[model samples]
Target: GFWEEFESLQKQEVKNLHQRLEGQRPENKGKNRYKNILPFDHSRVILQGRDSNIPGSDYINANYIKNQLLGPDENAKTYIASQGCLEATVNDFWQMAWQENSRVIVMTTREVEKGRNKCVPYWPEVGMQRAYGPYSVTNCGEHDTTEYKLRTLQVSPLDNGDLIREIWHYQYLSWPDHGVPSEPGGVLSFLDQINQRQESLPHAGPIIVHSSAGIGRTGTIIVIDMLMENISTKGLDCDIDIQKTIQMVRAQRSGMVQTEAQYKFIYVAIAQFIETTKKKLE
Candidate 1:
């Protein structure tokens, strides 16, 4: 039944990716990591402090996703769904991070996967720093664990270095191209750690999540996290609908949850999370 629903959703794929506002502009066309995957104009993220003279200097291919399952108010945007950075747009990426007050970045794909560049090394190596536009990013250190590398980064305006803010870069290393991880445990733990570190921050902005196109694995991960959050706060009896949850995100950003397989992976990930929670309760 679920697979059938996904099959129907897959057919509307072209309609989902139709280029609107910023993506339709000739100047902002090259900013996108993928040609067809464009952010919707309504929820698109516009760079506030960009200092360029170009036509669409404030444009970046990203959208704000506010899942309905979260707090009754549904007030602040919960997460940012974005495409991985291109060499030309890396500076815009940092400027976005700086402007949004976003501290956590979840990279779902490797920089170069299957001999193709997914995203640029947006941050420098440990003990090194890089200047992007007016922002200076310093990589304090990088530490690795089982499936991810956690890099501590300090972002400061070049003119006002005293107001440096820290960012936690969670670069997940285990995901394969166009497929979900074999075991859901790894991803569950990753999401747990993301929330733990996010809560540790006294004040933080929406989490920035990206893959190659910021739709496939990116959407899958965010959907799972949203459902997981619902369960954690509302308990086992709360209603959780996977299909509707993803549909809401896709409305904000075109072509979210790209493949049918990823859509299926969402259900499997939720199943495992529910099963594991039951076992823990016992």
Candidate 2:
């Protein structure tokens, strides 16, 4: 996985983004710096990483970039990246997503790691889960020896409560620690899940993904998601290059999609998604 690359990141992006935080210090310091607002839609789903300290209920909690707040369709899918921490923490985030009536899916490589393997058997006690369990099984739990769980539960979010098109999960093949592929089966799986779920849910399309920070893993995942969407809707067979789209992502998401590893993953994943599409078309 490329996770090590970010270890020395100095978290410059966060500071830079905050610095880009224009506007006078609001008189109400308690009030968040950025206006807490999201362009909720029912067509596309929402995707994001574990929003530390921030309330899971808010959109900025996901480190949402200006583009995300502006671009995501009204019906977008939302995916919350769980860093294999304690089930309680993961469940707590999921609870917020679920309360929003959003479809939920979870991912993790192992069930017992220092910070990543905690969502296995993701049932909040017998009483709690039964009282408020998720709607579908996109709830993927990673039992893999590697960190293949980064892109698991790759479902999209929509503003509407209805299920439209969802994605699939191809996880556990490798971790960013060992050069995790950006567009492994999980990318395709996310699309497959969307197509399959749409059979019953209908109207849903595209994917929403995230990781621990919505920067590294999340950025990589979004690249793959958008690439696939372009192919699915636009038609690659007709000569629609993907580089422009990828650049667009960077232009919009900007520092939100930090890390060269994540960028490389996206580059690699484009080929993977295209290959999968080729197979499907053939």
Candidate 3:
């Protein structure tokens, strides 16, 4: 009964993502002048405590982050979808990273796009290190793929000075600003790399995934990863439902799967992945 009801409701209520984008509701505009855009109140991530010195600043701090849950039961906060770092909020970004115990940073946008600063250059160079607030991030090493580059980041809290943790930074470079890739193969391959690396770190924190706005391409990658997981469990039949998976993601973070093109990209990518998997099995 529960399954049937859920299926019926999903079929009846799911709207086209393109239509949703055309009529997006007004976001909550708080006093913060730095945020590129306001985050949805329901899906925003609020830090556990007020670690900052400023009183009542946590309200602004919580608005830019959203916790993304994954797995079949959707019980895990496996990812964090956040807006790109602003010049004024770079320290807050690192603070959130350290506090959340995040070990992976998936950046889907470049530092500059169309001559606009989309995201701040947050990480350090290959052999050098940079400090942000109380945290120090060093770009230790790198692994290059056909579509993306994975870097090893060593983050150390300066309080103790000796304690350090490794965080992976995966950068997807070819995707344009506010658009999907011409072909899904590059993205699918990049997703495989992310999955493999995550498997290697079974006990790490949630992966931080961000695009310019954090919901467009960011949402697409997240949905594709989760749906592919479902396919691995349910086979290539109609059992793996992209529509239902997207609904779960949107419930956690509003405005996910931003455009009709991105929504369609998910289906095409997943289908290609499934077909490729079948060939390997054969």
Most lDDT-accurate candidate: 1
Q: 1-282 in candidate 3: lDDT tens per residue?
A: 434544553454355222221112323132233343345455455554464565433432232332233335543337787777776667777877888788878888887878977787788878889998788889999887756888898999878779899888899987776688999998888878777777788777777888777777888888787767666655666356666676767665555666667777887899898999888879
Q: What are the RMSD figures for all models against the true structure?
A: 2.0, 9.3, 6.4
**TM-score of every candidate:** 0.93, 0.50, 0.79
Clashing pairs in 1: none
Candidate 3's TM-score: 0.79
lDDT of 3 at 120: 79
Number of clashing residue pairs, candidate 2: 52
Ranking by TM-score: 1, 3, 2
lDDT values, one for every candidate: 0.84, 0.40, 0.69
